[PDB]
Amino acid sequence: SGPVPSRARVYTDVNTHRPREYWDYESHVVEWGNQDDYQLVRKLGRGKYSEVFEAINITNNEKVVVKILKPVKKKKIKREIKILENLRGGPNIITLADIVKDPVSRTPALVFEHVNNTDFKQLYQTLTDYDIRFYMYEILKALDYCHSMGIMHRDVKPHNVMIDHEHRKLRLIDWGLAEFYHPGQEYNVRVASRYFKGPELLVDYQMYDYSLDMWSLGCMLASMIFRKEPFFHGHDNYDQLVRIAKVLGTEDLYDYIDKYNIELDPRFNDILGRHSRKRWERFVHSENQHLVSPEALDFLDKLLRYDHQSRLTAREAMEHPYFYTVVKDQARMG
């Protein structure tokens, strides 16, 4: 009795083909910038999830966003900084600018590029079918890039997507749970907010990969097209799989449990029991029908699969018909 090993379908050994220092964050020596160069303007309010500030970098007068990280392990701080530096410049990924410690708290602070405060959460339930397609493809750009750079985000959810309303500039943020993918590495199942936890985390399948981000994105998509926030509404980690099972059916769940020989608690197995597969047309109602099309259902169907290996890659996702017209967007800004 033992869980079978798994491998990522794409970008499998990207980190291996790179030098050690690219992914060996525990050896990274953190370069510090001057605190006296940054002055905080106003508390930008991450909804009391974190300490986010507007700040002026006085040495160049430019505006910066400063986040003071809640006191975590030295290991996890090293990770994020190395991840952000490596990902710097990529499409729709927050640009890290400086690393500073606060003198009145001894707490590390991250400095980011110009950001206007609009959380995707309070927007994604009121947007056109076209703009759902537009921003989804923008997120994919970030995820395809960061996966190719050997990094799983591990907290894909609308609260961690920031959108500049007026410029339509989308930045994927919150890389505090992000981790370098290495073939054959066991990863923590504690990552990701429950509503966006993939089946792999929910069954304790520990050798998952980038394909985790794609499930979460499927949950985000499901939320937008059906106007159900959130789509899978688990009141419990166990109930989260129940809510999933009541939609995709239990059959394919037991294929997934069998395939990778995952040992699931026979008591949890009892509660899961037998649920039939539901077609998405049953989530369709008057309010959301205009936000739903066959290509939307097809894409989502190819994201919300139990078997992580059978979910679309970020690249395969960017080539789906669902985004066919939106790739030709004419960047109208009013």
Distance (Å, whole) CA 109 – CA 209: 29
How many other CB atoms are there within 10 angstroms of residue 239's CB atom?
Answer: 15
- The smaller minimum CB distance to Cl ion, of residues 146 and 245, is found at 146
CA-wise closest residue to 139 among 188, 90, 179: 90
How many residues touch Cl ion under the rule CB under 5 A: the total is 8
Residue 99, SS3?
A: strand
Q: Of the residues 155, 174, 209, 213, which is catalytic? A: 155
Q: Does the annotation place 46 within a ligand binding site?
A: yes
Cα three-residue angle 32-34-38, rounded to 5 degrees:
125
Residues followed by a gap in the chain, C→N > 2.5 Å: none
Of 183, 230, 234, 249, the one binding Cl ion (CB under 5 A) is 183
Interaction of residue 305 with Cl ion, rule CB under 5 A: no
**H or E element at residue 55:** strand 51-57
Question: If you compute the radius of gyration of the chain from its CA atoms, what whole number of angstroms results?
Answer: 20
Q: Specify whether the CB–CB gap between 65 and 113 falls below 8 A.
A: yes
Q: Does the annotation place 45 within a ligand binding site?
A: yes
Respond yes or no: is residue 155 known to be catalytic. Answer: yes
Distance (Å, whole) CA 137 – CA 142: 9
Of 132, 178, 192, 314, the one binding Cl ion (CB under 5 A) is 314
CB of 136 to Cl ion, least distance (A): 15
Q: Which stretch binds Cl ion (CB under 5 A): 161-169, 199-207, 230-238, 274-282?
A: 199-207
Distance (Å, whole) CA 112 – CA 89: 12
Q: How far is CA 78 from the centre of its chain?
A: 20
- The smaller minimum CB distance to Cl ion, of residues 190 and 267, is found at 190
CB of 186 to Cl ion, least distance (A): 9
Q: Does the annotation place 51 within a ligand binding site?
A: yes
Interaction of residue 210 with Cl ion, rule CB under 5 A: yes
Interaction of residue 99 with Cl ion, rule CB under 5 A: no
Binding mask 140-179 for Cl ion (x = CB under 5 A): -------x-------------------------xx-----
- Which residues sit at the interface with Cl ion, rule CB under 5 A? 147, 173-174, 183, 207, 210, 313-314
Q: Extract the annotated binding site for ATP.
A: 44-52, 67
Residues noted as catalytic: 155
